[PDB]
Structures are given as C-alpha cells and as structure tokens.
Nucleic acid binder design. Structure first.
Ligand SMILES: [K+]
Ligand SMILES: [K+]
Ligand SMILES: [K+]
Ligand SMILES: [K+]
Ligand SMILES: [K+]
Ligand SMILES: [K+]
Ligand SMILES: [Mg+2]
Ligand SMILES: [Mg+2]
Ligand SMILES: [Mg+2]
Ligand SMILES: [Mg+2]
Ligand SMILES: [Mg+2]
Ligand SMILES: [Mg+2]
Ligand SMILES: [Mg+2]
Ligand SMILES: [Mg+2]
Ligand SMILES: [Mg+2]
Ligand SMILES: [Mg+2]
Ligand SMILES: [Mg+2]
Ligand SMILES: [Mg+2]
Ligand SMILES: [Mg+2]
Ligand SMILES: [Mg+2]
Ligand SMILES: [Mg+2]
Ligand SMILES: [Mg+2]
Ligand SMILES: [Mg+2]
Ligand SMILES: [Mg+2]
Ligand SMILES: [Mg+2]
Ligand SMILES: [Mg+2]
Ligand SMILES: [Mg+2]
Ligand SMILES: [Mg+2]
Ligand SMILES: [Mg+2]
Ligand SMILES: [Mg+2]
Ligand SMILES: [Mg+2]
Ligand SMILES: [Mg+2]
Ligand SMILES: [Mg+2]
Ligand SMILES: [Mg+2]
Ligand SMILES: [Mg+2]
Ligand SMILES: [Mg+2]
Ligand SMILES: [Mg+2]
Ligand SMILES: [Mg+2]
Ligand SMILES: [Mg+2]
Ligand SMILES: [Mg+2]
Ligand SMILES: [Mg+2]
Ligand SMILES: [Mg+2]
Ligand SMILES: [Mg+2]
Ligand SMILES: [Mg+2]
Ligand SMILES: [Mg+2]
Ligand SMILES: [Mg+2]
Ligand SMILES: [Mg+2]
Ligand SMILES: [Mg+2]
Ligand SMILES: [Mg+2]
Ligand SMILES: [Mg+2]
Ligand SMILES: [Mg+2]
Ligand SMILES: [Mg+2]
Ligand SMILES: [Mg+2]
Ligand SMILES: [Mg+2]
Ligand SMILES: [Mg+2]
Ligand SMILES: [Mg+2]
Ligand SMILES: [Mg+2]
Ligand SMILES: [Mg+2]
Ligand SMILES: [Mg+2]
Ligand SMILES: [Mg+2]
Ligand SMILES: [Mg+2]
Ligand SMILES: [Mg+2]
Ligand SMILES: [Mg+2]
Ligand SMILES: [Mg+2]
Ligand SMILES: [Mg+2]
Ligand SMILES: [Mg+2]
Ligand SMILES: [Mg+2]
Ligand SMILES: [Mg+2]
Ligand SMILES: [Mg+2]
Ligand SMILES: [Mg+2]
Ligand SMILES: [Mg+2]
Ligand SMILES: [Mg+2]
Ligand SMILES: [Mg+2]
Ligand SMILES: [Mg+2]
Ligand SMILES: [Mg+2]
Ligand SMILES: [Mg+2]
Ligand SMILES: [Mg+2]
Ligand SMILES: [Mg+2]
Ligand SMILES: [Mg+2]
Ligand SMILES: [Mg+2]
Ligand SMILES: [Mg+2]
Ligand SMILES: [Mg+2]
Ligand SMILES: [Mg+2]
Ligand SMILES: [Mg+2]
Ligand SMILES: [Mg+2]
Ligand SMILES: [Mg+2]
Ligand SMILES: [Mg+2]
Ligand SMILES: [Mg+2]
Ligand SMILES: [Mg+2]
Ligand SMILES: [Mg+2]
Ligand SMILES: [Mg+2]
Ligand SMILES: [Mg+2]
Ligand SMILES: [Mg+2]
Ligand SMILES: [Mg+2]
Ligand SMILES: [Mg+2]
Ligand SMILES: [Mg+2]
Ligand SMILES: [Mg+2]
Ligand SMILES: [Mg+2]
Ligand SMILES: [Mg+2]
Ligand SMILES: [Mg+2]
Ligand SMILES: [Mg+2]
Ligand SMILES: [Mg+2]
Ligand SMILES: [Mg+2]
Ligand SMILES: [Mg+2]
Ligand SMILES: [Mg+2]
Ligand SMILES: [Mg+2]
Ligand SMILES: [Mg+2]
Ligand SMILES: [Mg+2]
Ligand SMILES: [Mg+2]
Ligand SMILES: [Mg+2]
Ligand SMILES: [Mg+2]
Ligand SMILES: [Mg+2]
Ligand SMILES: [Mg+2]
Ligand SMILES: [Mg+2]
Ligand SMILES: [Mg+2]
Ligand SMILES: [Mg+2]
Ligand SMILES: [Mg+2]
Ligand SMILES: [Mg+2]
Ligand SMILES: [Mg+2]
Ligand SMILES: [Mg+2]
Ligand SMILES: [Mg+2]
Ligand SMILES: [Mg+2]
Ligand SMILES: [Mg+2]
Ligand SMILES: [Mg+2]
Ligand SMILES: [Mg+2]
Ligand SMILES: [Mg+2]
Ligand SMILES: [Mg+2]
Ligand SMILES: [Zn+2]
Lengths: 204, 5, 37, 140, 174
RNA sequence: CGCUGAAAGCAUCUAAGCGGGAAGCCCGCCCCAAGAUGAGGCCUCCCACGGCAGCCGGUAAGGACCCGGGAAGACCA
RNA sequence: CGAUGUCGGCUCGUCGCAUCCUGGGGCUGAAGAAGGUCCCAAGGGUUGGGCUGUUCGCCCAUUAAAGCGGCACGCGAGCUG
RNA sequence: AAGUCUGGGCUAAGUGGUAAAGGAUGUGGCGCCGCGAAGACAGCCA
C-alpha cells in the first residue's frame, strides 16, 4: 500500500508494439510528508501528504504552525494515504514502476441538476403517437393504496456528478522522473487541472 | 373518471 | 433420498434413526433411503 | 394532608458484575435500580434512580439454544432493508449491545425513559473508567 | 451387557491423572487430553481405571458408555498405537511420498498432495497401499476419511480409494 | 457426506465432542456517513481586556460582507 | 352511488418461491455423454420479430434460460385511448 | 399496581406463542405376555 497526490494533465495516446495506447498524463511528484498517523496516538496508520506549494501570505496561523512542526514549506493540499508509511520525508513518482496496476480517485465532472434520462438512463416517453408533454419524464413512481408511499432510494432527478469516484486496476504505462510524470492507461475521473490520488491497487 | 357502466 | 410424510421400513434391513430432529430411514439398498419432509 | 414530595438528591453510583448471570434476569434488576423504585421516596415523574456501571458484559449467560436461535433485527427503511443478526454474532462483535438492548426494552418509553437509559454504563471486560465516581459494588 | 462398568486394563508405561473435567493420559508414544463430563466420577486404582455414574436415568447411562470407551481408546492409543490402511485401485492410479506429504495420482489432470497434520504419520509400503498412523483415534479416522474422499470408489468399476476390508459392490453398466 | 461414540456388549453423522460442504449469509471491494444529541479522535493557532454557570462594550486566533471569477452551480452552497 | 376511472400498451419498479437458467446435492430402469425425479438455493439473469385492440395463444429466428404469481388482476392529479 | 411465594410432577420443542389424515427406537409413567444359569437377546465359530 502506497500512494501519491497528483494533478490530471490531459489525455493523449502513445505507440507500443505497433499498438496505440490511450493514456492519461498525471503530474504527481513531489509530496512532502507533513504528519504521520500512528496507532499509539491516532488508532490507525496513515501518512498526511502535501502538494501544490502555496504563497505564505495566504497561510493563516493554525496552518503555519502545523507546517512548521514538520519543517516543510506550506502547500495547498493536505491528504492522507491510509496504511502507508514512507521511508523518507518526501514521496516521488519513483514509488511506481511500469507494469504496475493502480487505483485513481478524483472528483468527477459536475452535471448540476440532471434529469432521469441522463442521471439514471431512463427510457423516457415516446416522441409521437399521441405522447403528451412526457417525453423525458420518469413515468410511474409507485403503486396504489398499498403501500401508499415511495421507497427510499427511488431513482429521481437531482444533482449528478461532482463526486468522489475511484477507477480501479489501471496499468502504469510509463514513469518520467525528470518532469514528475506518471502515465496510466485509460481514463481518469474529473477535468484537467483537478486533484487526483494514485494508490497501489486493491485487486489481485 | 369516465363512463363507469 | 425419498422425502415424504410417511417414512417406513421397506425391507427387513431398513433402519429407522433420528438425527437433528428429523426421522430418517437408512438402508444398505440405496433406493430405501428416506427423510420425513 | 398532602403526600410527601422529595427534594433533589445527589444520586448513587452502583457497580454490577455480569459474569455468569442470566441475561434477562439480570436486566430486570438493572431496570428497577435505574427507575429508583428501591427508594421509599420514589416519584414517577423525576429521574431519581441510580447510575449503574456494568462490567464483564461479554460473559453474560443465556439458556437453551438462544445463542444460535435468538435474532436481533434492524430495519433501514430501504427495500429489502431488514437485517438479521444472531445473538452469537452480536456477542462476538458488539458484546455491550446485548445487555443494553435487554435493559432498554424494560424501561418506560418517552423522554424520562430515554434519560434513564443514559445512566447505564456497560463495558465488556473487568475495568471501567468511572473510578472518580467510586461505584459501590452490588450483588445481583 | 454394559460398556461403562468394565474397568480399563491400563498397561505399564501409561499413567492417567484424573482432573476436573479432564483425564490426562501419558505414555511412551505421547500424551492425550480426554475431556470428561464433570457430572461423573473417574477413579484410578492399581492397574485399573473405572468410571461410575451417579444415577440411573437415560443421560447418565449414555455418558457412562461414552466416558469409558473414549478413555480406553486413549490408553490403547499411547500403548499400542492406531493405524488405518488405504488401498488404491485402478490401472494407472498409484501413490508416492513427497518428503512428509503424500502424493496421489488418481486420474485428475493434476497431482493431489496432502500435508499431514500434526500428530499423523504417512507410510507408503507399495504404490497401491497407504498407511496412516498416529496416537489419536479420532484424528487417524478423520485423516483417513479425508484421503478417501479425494477419489471415492466407483459404482461401476473396481477403481478408486478403498478402506482395508471394505467390500466391493458393483452394478452392471451395459 | 463424514470422524470418533453411547444409551441398546452389536450398530448408529449425535445424545458429549470434532470435520467437510452452495452463484446463497457475514466480512472483504466502491460510495455516503459523528444531529452516532452515544454529537468521537489527532495536529496547529488564540488568549487570562475592561465595566457590573449572567449582563454591556472594545479585541485575539479567525470569519463574514463587498468585488474578479470558476469543467462549482436553479437560488444557496 | 353529496363518484373508490374501469382492458391492453408504455414508463417505473418492488416483493414471494410452489425455481425457467445459472450454483450445490440424494436416487436412478445413472457405462460415458445426454437425461429423469426429488432436496437445498431468490444473488444475478430471464432476447428480437409476424398475426390480432387484445390479455391469451400460435408462428419465425435465436438463447444458459426465454419461470409462475402479489402489490386496488401494481402504476391515467405519470402518458396513451 | 401486586409472590423472581411454598409444595409435588412434566416439557427441551422457545413447544408454550395458530392447522388435518398419516408417520416415528422423542420422553416420562403404568400394564399384559414370552424366553431366562431346564443358562436366554446381542457379539463370535459353525
Ligand atoms: K358507487
Ligand atoms: K412483477
Ligand atoms: K440430479
Ligand atoms: K434468484
Ligand atoms: K385470443
Ligand atoms: K407416547
Ligand atoms: Mg484523504
Ligand atoms: Mg479530480
Ligand atoms: Mg479530488
Ligand atoms: Mg468536478
Ligand atoms: Mg448547473
Ligand atoms: Mg429526464
Ligand atoms: Mg442517457
Ligand atoms: Mg438531460
Ligand atoms: Mg442528455
Ligand atoms: Mg448516467
Ligand atoms: Mg447516478
Ligand atoms: Mg445507467
Ligand atoms: Mg425508449
Ligand atoms: Mg415519459
Ligand atoms: Mg412512456
Ligand atoms: Mg426516446
Ligand atoms: Mg415530440
Ligand atoms: Mg396517436
Ligand atoms: Mg397512441
Ligand atoms: Mg407508442
Ligand atoms: Mg403525437
Ligand atoms: Mg393528445
Ligand atoms: Mg404516451
Ligand atoms: Mg401531460
Ligand atoms: Mg410534444
Ligand atoms: Mg424522449
Ligand atoms: Mg412521469
Ligand atoms: Mg415505480
Ligand atoms: Mg390506479
Ligand atoms: Mg388512488
Ligand atoms: Mg402504508
Ligand atoms: Mg416507490
Ligand atoms: Mg432504493
Ligand atoms: Mg439507493
Ligand atoms: Mg435518485
Ligand atoms: Mg425526478
Ligand atoms: Mg443539483
Ligand atoms: Mg408415501
Ligand atoms: Mg422516576
Ligand atoms: Mg428514576
Ligand atoms: Mg436465558
Ligand atoms: Mg444458548
Ligand atoms: Mg428484498
Ligand atoms: Mg425478504
Ligand atoms: Mg437495502
Ligand atoms: Mg452433539
Ligand atoms: Mg441461502
Ligand atoms: Mg457464496
Ligand atoms: Mg450522517
Ligand atoms: Mg467525519
Ligand atoms: Mg446543519
Ligand atoms: Mg440517524
Ligand atoms: Mg461532532
Ligand atoms: Mg438569490
Ligand atoms: Mg448564482
Ligand atoms: Mg453561488
Ligand atoms: Mg449546491
Ligand atoms: Mg458561499
Ligand atoms: Mg363532494
Ligand atoms: Mg366526499
Ligand atoms: Mg366512485
Ligand atoms: Mg379518488
Ligand atoms: Mg382503464
Ligand atoms: Mg389495465
Ligand atoms: Mg394493446
Ligand atoms: Mg395492464
Ligand atoms: Mg404493459
Ligand atoms: Mg412496459
Ligand atoms: Mg417499449
Ligand atoms: Mg406494465
Ligand atoms: Mg419498462
Ligand atoms: Mg419512475
Ligand atoms: Mg424499467
Ligand atoms: Mg421475482
Ligand atoms: Mg424451496
Ligand atoms: Mg440448478
Ligand atoms: Mg444444480
Ligand atoms: Mg453422466
Ligand atoms: Mg430428494
Ligand atoms: Mg434430499
Ligand atoms: Mg427443493
Ligand atoms: Mg429458494
Ligand atoms: Mg423471495
Ligand atoms: Mg426464498
Ligand atoms: Mg431477432
Ligand atoms: Mg416474445
Ligand atoms: Mg424484425
Ligand atoms: Mg410475439
Ligand atoms: Mg408482416
Ligand atoms: Mg416486418
Ligand atoms: Mg405486434
Ligand atoms: Mg399478441
Ligand atoms: Mg397489426
Ligand atoms: Mg392461437
Ligand atoms: Mg430457432
Ligand atoms: Mg422460436
Ligand atoms: Mg442455447
Ligand atoms: Mg395479494
Ligand atoms: Mg388486489
Ligand atoms: Mg380487475
Ligand atoms: Mg391489470
Ligand atoms: Mg399486472
Ligand atoms: Mg390495474
Ligand atoms: Mg396492469
Ligand atoms: Mg397504469
Ligand atoms: Mg393502472
Ligand atoms: Mg387520462
Ligand atoms: Mg389505462
Ligand atoms: Mg393514480
Ligand atoms: Mg387521480
Ligand atoms: Mg389519485
Ligand atoms: Mg393506446
Ligand atoms: Mg379507457
Ligand atoms: Mg375509441
Ligand atoms: Mg381516437
Ligand atoms: Mg420460587
Ligand atoms: Mg410440553
Ligand atoms: Mg421443532
Ligand atoms: Mg413444533
Ligand atoms: Mg415461541
Ligand atoms: Mg410455536
Ligand atoms: Zn431396506
């Protein structure tokens, strides 16, 4: 179990063994170690990692003292990697080698208030043959007098996206330590510029 | 409702 | 296994036993195996 | 003449060991102490019972085949949301809940009964963190 | 017409110390613990162990027979031992011994290896004969049953893994 | 489906005890979650101003208003 | 009866198990393969089309299979007519 | 609200706390008969 914080850069494709490989580029390193969580004091094992260094004029006193205890420059993002205890005080892309599999967590793009056709892939209504103002409507939401109510968890229109999403078992295609770049095969949640977390996969 | 017969 | 409400010895070698709250007929002839159910 | 009304009194802290006790027959005695019905000045509309500390709750005893046959149920409000947990599993994972559940069902419903449940402190194991209150040991 | 009233003719080299709810047997082959119901009294005398029951109802008559035979099995185990013999039959089927673990070639696409548990010893005098030995009658029977369950005797052919002395009963297939 | 084994000298998967065994059950995977009023935990920051388990002000660490915006968004957040 | 809208279709489901498929077993008049019958099992799944307003049924081409029922014969302040 | 009251017995199924014909070495209690050191039932050699 090991992980690193990063930023989604973009998508392209590379050629390998006469095959086109769609990849997502991620700028990951370097992550200073800010705090370590221990079972003796916290009840579990984790490491708090920092990312995206910040102008000191925007750091308030509670955060400045927190950074000063670790002896690091103030960063913008603080995130924990559960069950990880890095050897040094800084985590880099070198922790990953090509061929390894990773899980990537990010915040998916936000669709706002979305209808049942987009949020839940509802069939909707007919577009001709007398259909009356119900083309994108959900249809029936229940039964009669029994039970005379709507179940909890009923699929309805509402906020869609802008939520935490993890994609599992992505293959690491290339590691470029000069520019702190990690290449993973396939697609990663969120927009370009959004924060992501790359961890060793839970699959086997 | 309509014709109920 | 035969599962029925009326379990009885079919032949002179059939044996009636009770295990875990159920009546069974067990016998050397595999056709004679029975459970009450 | 009018019936005597007690004035507020500092309450008593009591310590009970649950080692080897029958679950239901112990829960009855606890519920009586929480209600304060052992006091000649008992009043139905005030909280005037004892604070009860229980230790070794994981070592409660049950008769028959209740370890595999007694089922606790929880309903989540979702379709198919009825969860069933046998007693032996509850003892392994949340031992304190078994005695807590038995006592709660024996208290009056409503605001006062909810407060009385707050005065019960159940621990699995022989130690409790209430040494400052100095609970006097009681034989049940 | 009883089982629990007979004392156990314990031989020398075997020492049995009674205990609350337990009987500890020590011999030249090893030691065994035999949990005895506290509802009964076990007494050890000169070269004899005898079990008595405290009443005459169904439960105490049932435990009297159970208590004596288990102790007698334990004392026999640490004096003479216990064994079970398995036969492997079929044209290509056979067995061999890998280190301490046993090897089965029983017509699967892969070989099957069995790791003996603690207190159990394997012997392969012939490729078509396996012996299981140990001090525990329950474990000897269980381990022998485990190996037989790998390839049970066929109902149409004289092929598979059989107990010593197990009769062969076939039915026509054509 | 068994191992050991009584009652019932035999036998028996059972009465004591111990194993094997399902796309099913409990964890495990992903997501939400301390209004979990049982309101949890850890790191850092601020300090004992004045005037008389409370009342009136001036502040601290911080926050809000306002403004430029945003793959965030009905408004709000 | 100072009103409880009635078939079929569509949409949206959810539940039961007397189980259609998939998982696990006993027996077989079980050589093998393919079946028959009973037991356990409701997690998931259970196609497209022609005829007819049809439900139902028949037919075509498939499939691991093309289950049976409840929910005011589920669902018109959701649509159709 | 008032007996974790007293004495004797039964049940192990949470039966009690939702059903029939039928089936069964469940368990407790009583009986009628048979064969029994004119050595019996079971086990073992026939
Ligand atoms: K009417
Ligand atoms: K349905
Ligand atoms: K079958
Ligand atoms: K199912
Ligand atoms: K028709
Ligand atoms: K009877
Ligand atoms: Mg985190
Ligand atoms: Mg992101
Ligand atoms: Mg993110
Ligand atoms: Mg987003
Ligand atoms: Mg929007
Ligand atoms: Mg829509
Ligand atoms: Mg869509
Ligand atoms: Mg839309
Ligand atoms: Mg759309
Ligand atoms: Mg969608
Ligand atoms: Mg969605
Ligand atoms: Mg969808
Ligand atoms: Mg559609
Ligand atoms: Mg519609
Ligand atoms: Mg529609
Ligand atoms: Mg459409
Ligand atoms: Mg239209
Ligand atoms: Mg039309
Ligand atoms: Mg139309
Ligand atoms: Mg239409
Ligand atoms: Mg139209
Ligand atoms: Mg119209
Ligand atoms: Mg329509
Ligand atoms: Mg309309
Ligand atoms: Mg229109
Ligand atoms: Mg439409
Ligand atoms: Mg609608
Ligand atoms: Mg619906
Ligand atoms: Mg209706
Ligand atoms: Mg209605
Ligand atoms: Mg209702
Ligand atoms: Mg509903
Ligand atoms: Mg739901
Ligand atoms: Mg839901
Ligand atoms: Mg919804
Ligand atoms: Mg909606
Ligand atoms: Mg929204
Ligand atoms: Mg019959
Ligand atoms: Mg009171
Ligand atoms: Mg009280
Ligand atoms: Mg009990
Ligand atoms: Mg129990
Ligand atoms: Mg359900
Ligand atoms: Mg259900
Ligand atoms: Mg649910
Ligand atoms: Mg048992
Ligand atoms: Mg199941
Ligand atoms: Mg499973
Ligand atoms: Mg919450
Ligand atoms: Mg939280
Ligand atoms: Mg709030
Ligand atoms: Mg809640
Ligand atoms: Mg809180
Ligand atoms: Mg506004
Ligand atoms: Mg706005
Ligand atoms: Mg806004
Ligand atoms: Mg919002
Ligand atoms: Mg805001
Ligand atoms: Mg009216
Ligand atoms: Mg009216
Ligand atoms: Mg009407
Ligand atoms: Mg109406
Ligand atoms: Mg209608
Ligand atoms: Mg209709
Ligand atoms: Mg129609
Ligand atoms: Mg209809
Ligand atoms: Mg329809
Ligand atoms: Mg439809
Ligand atoms: Mg359609
Ligand atoms: Mg429909
Ligand atoms: Mg539909
Ligand atoms: Mg709907
Ligand atoms: Mg649908
Ligand atoms: Mg169904
Ligand atoms: Mg069934
Ligand atoms: Mg099947
Ligand atoms: Mg099957
Ligand atoms: Mg076959
Ligand atoms: Mg059957
Ligand atoms: Mg069966
Ligand atoms: Mg069945
Ligand atoms: Mg089922
Ligand atoms: Mg069901
Ligand atoms: Mg079911
Ligand atoms: Mg087609
Ligand atoms: Mg069709
Ligand atoms: Mg077509
Ligand atoms: Mg058709
Ligand atoms: Mg045509
Ligand atoms: Mg056509
Ligand atoms: Mg048609
Ligand atoms: Mg038709
Ligand atoms: Mg037509
Ligand atoms: Mg037809
Ligand atoms: Mg066809
Ligand atoms: Mg066809
Ligand atoms: Mg097919
Ligand atoms: Mg109904
Ligand atoms: Mg109805
Ligand atoms: Mg109708
Ligand atoms: Mg209908
Ligand atoms: Mg219907
Ligand atoms: Mg209807
Ligand atoms: Mg309908
Ligand atoms: Mg409808
Ligand atoms: Mg309707
Ligand atoms: Mg209408
Ligand atoms: Mg209609
Ligand atoms: Mg309606
Ligand atoms: Mg209406
Ligand atoms: Mg209505
Ligand atoms: Mg229509
Ligand atoms: Mg109509
Ligand atoms: Mg018309
Ligand atoms: Mg018309
Ligand atoms: Mg009494
Ligand atoms: Mg009874
Ligand atoms: Mg029962
Ligand atoms: Mg019953
Ligand atoms: Mg009951
Ligand atoms: Mg009952
Ligand atoms: Zn028979």
């Amino acid at each position: 179990m090991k992980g690193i914080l990063g930023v989604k850069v973009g998508m392209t494709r590379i050629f390998r063994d006469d095959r086109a490989v769609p990849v997502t580029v991620i700028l990951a390193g370097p992550c200073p170690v800010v705090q370590r969580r221990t079972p003796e004091k916290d009840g579990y094992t984790a490491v708090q990692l920092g990312f995206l260094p910040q102008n000191p004029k925007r750091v308030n006193r509670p955060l400045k003292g927190h950074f000063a205890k670790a002896g690091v420059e103030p960063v913008r993002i603080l995130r924990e990697i559960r069950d990880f205890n890095p050897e040094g005080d800084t985590v880099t892309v070198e922790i990953f080698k090509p061929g390894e599999r990773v899980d990537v967590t990010g915040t998916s793009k936000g669709r706002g208030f979305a209808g049942v056709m987009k949020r839940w892939n509802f069939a909707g209504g007919p577009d001709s043959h007398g259909a009356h103002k119900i083309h994108r409507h959900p249809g029936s939401i229940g039964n009669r007098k029994t039970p005379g109510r709507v179940y909890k968890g009923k699929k309805m229109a509402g906020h869609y996206g802008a939520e935490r999403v993890t994609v599992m078992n992505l293959e690491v295609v290339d590691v470029i330590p000069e520019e702190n770049l990690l290449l993973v095969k396939g697609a990663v949640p969120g927009p370009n510029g959004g924060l992501v977390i790359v961890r060793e996969t839970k699959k086997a | 409702a309509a014709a109920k017969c | 296994m035969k599962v029925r409400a009326s379990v009885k010895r079919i032949c002179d070698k059939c044996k009636v036993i009770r295990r875990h709250g159920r009546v069974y007929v067990i016998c050397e002839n595999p056709k004679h195996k029975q459970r009450q159910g | 003449m009018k019936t005597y009304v007690p004035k507020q009194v500092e309450p008593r802290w009591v310590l009970i060991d649950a080692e080897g006790k029958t679950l239901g027959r112990l829960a009855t005695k606890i519920a009586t102490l929480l209600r304060g019905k052992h006091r000649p000045d008992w009043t139905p509309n005030v909280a005037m019972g004892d604070f009860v500390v229980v230790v070794n709750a994981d070592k409660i005893r049950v008769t028959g085949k209740k370890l595999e046959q007694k089922i606790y149920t929880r309903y989540s409000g979702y379709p198919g949301g009825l969860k069933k947990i046998p007693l032996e599993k509850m003892l392994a994972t949340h031992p304190e809940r078994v005695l807590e559940h038995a006592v709660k069902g024996m208290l009056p419903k409503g605001p006062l009964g909810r407060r009385l449940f707050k005065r019960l402190k159940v621990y699995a194991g022989p130690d409790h963190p209430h040494q400052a209150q100095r609970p006097e040991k009681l034989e049940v | 017409s009883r089982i629990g009233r007979l004392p156990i003719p314990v031989p020398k080299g075997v020492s049995v110390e009674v205990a609350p709810g337990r009987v500890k047997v020590k011999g030249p082959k090893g030691e065994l613990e035999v949990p005895v119901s506290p509802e009964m009294r076990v007494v050890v005398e000169e070269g004899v162990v005898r079990v008595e029951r405290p009443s005459d109802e169904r439960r105490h008559k049932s435990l009297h027979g159970l208590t004596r035979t288990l102790i007698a099995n334990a004392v026999k185990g640490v004096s003479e031992g216990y064994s079970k013999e398995l036969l492997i039959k079929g044209i290509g089927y056979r067995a061999r011994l890998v280190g301490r673990a046993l090897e089965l070639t029983v017509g699967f696409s892969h070989p099957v290896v069995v790791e003996p548990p603690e207190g159990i010893t394997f012997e392969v005098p012939e490729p078509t004969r396996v012996r299981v030995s140990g001090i525990d009658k329950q474990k000897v029977g269980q381990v022998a049953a485990n190996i037989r369950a790998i390839r049970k005797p066929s109902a149409y052919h004289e092929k598979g893994i059989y107990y010593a002395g197990e009769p062969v009963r076939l039915k026509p297939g054509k």
